[PDB]
């Protein structure tokens, strides 16, 4: 009766930090025996709940949010932390209880031709509200028109590639990150064991 968390982390299809991937877990027995106890995990940390207590902790629903970021930016996924990825791309609330996990994917997702298929966000008009999916295809600009009729000036496109390739140092090796959010409102809590 175990939840599909196993697949969630091992599906090795993670999309982008741009329009991250989500799953709404419910009605199962969350083991955790592997969670934060498997070997190649690099960083795992939760606020408000201890891991083992969590393993005995129980909730109403679950939200899993997987994405891919650059290694030097994992420190920006934190409550109210400020930077680029945590201000215009994906921003977690201030009272977020739960844990994040990050793996140095310096081998699984990189190609000499440039595993830059994903285009992260670099131009946004205003800061993000917590958990606000903002996948969009527009032209950030300065003057009257967007790049559809202008070029050079006012011709910006927020989706910029990463360009992950093996010569890159650790600070630029793609870290895969997965964040778990336990909701406790009206909880005919259906998940502990």
């Amino acid at each position, epitope marked *: 009766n175990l939840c599909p968390f196993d697949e969630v982390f091992n599906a090795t299809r993670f999309a982008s930090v741009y329009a991250w991937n989500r799953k709404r877990i419910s009605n199962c027995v969350a083991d955790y025996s592997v969670l934060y106890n498997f070997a190649p995990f690099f960083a795992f940390k939760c606020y408000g709940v201890s891991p083992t207590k969590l393993n005995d902790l129980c909730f109403t629903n679950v939200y899993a949010d997987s994405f891919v970021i650059r290694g*030097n930016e994992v420190s920006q996924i934190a409550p109210g932390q*400020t*930077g*680029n990825i945590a*201000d*215009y791309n994906y921003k977690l609330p201030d009272d977020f209880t739960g844990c994040v996990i990050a793996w140095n994917s310096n081998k699984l997702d990189s190609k000499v031709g440039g595993n830059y298929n994903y285009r992260y966000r*670099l*131009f*946004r*008009k*205003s*800061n993000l509200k917590p958990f606000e999916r903002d996948i969009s295809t527009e032209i*950030y600009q*300065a*003057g009257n028109k967007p790049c559809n009729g202008v070029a*050079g*000036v006012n011709c*910006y*496109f927020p989706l*910029q590639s990463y*360009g992950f*390739r093996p*010569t*890159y*140092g650790v*600070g*630029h090796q793609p870290y895969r990150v997965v964040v778990l959010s336990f909701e406790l409102l009206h909880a005919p809590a259906t998940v502990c064991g």
Partner: antibody
Amino acid sequence: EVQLVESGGGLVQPGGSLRLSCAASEITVSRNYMSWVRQAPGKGLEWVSVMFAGGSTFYADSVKGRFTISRDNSKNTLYLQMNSLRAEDTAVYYCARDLGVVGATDYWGQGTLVTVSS
Amino acid sequence: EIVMTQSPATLSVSPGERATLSCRASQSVSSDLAWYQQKPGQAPRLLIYGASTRATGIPARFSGSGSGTEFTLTISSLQSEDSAVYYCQQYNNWPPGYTFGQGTKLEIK
């Protein structure tokens, strides 16, 4: 023409305060990553501060805790308050709009000298 | 904090020939770089951004190359006005970060 013009440059006694201001034209600043740079007489350059398009600003470590960037968006302008100017901070300050991987810093300011009593 | 080192410090070449300036990084800067030409008396001017992409307008006489920790700028035919100072700026950390070089003074004859 597209430009950044500066003001506030001058002389002030150590420990005193000062405020540099930057006005722009044919280009917006509120939605433009702005960056103040400085240059000591005869030396290289060093990034001093940056303000984003959402307001979350950042400063270098050498001047961390003492300088504060702000901007009157209503009339398209930037500002940088400095205080407790010590012997090091005598330099010429430049205003800049950096794009990065999509065009590296390009539009800059005429500059503004900031020296101290001695 | 990546420390950049330019070379050589000074250069005096006869008019009309080629010129070669090296800028050396201390870590992996991949192809994230730029070159500024600050003619003495006003603000710098961007010449070449990214790895070797020539900024708009910038005369084709300039050419950038290199990758990783070592980069080079090359000038085809120095004209009388090319005498100026040049700086290589790296930006592997973009929001908020930049790290400059020591600059190079280029003159003619």
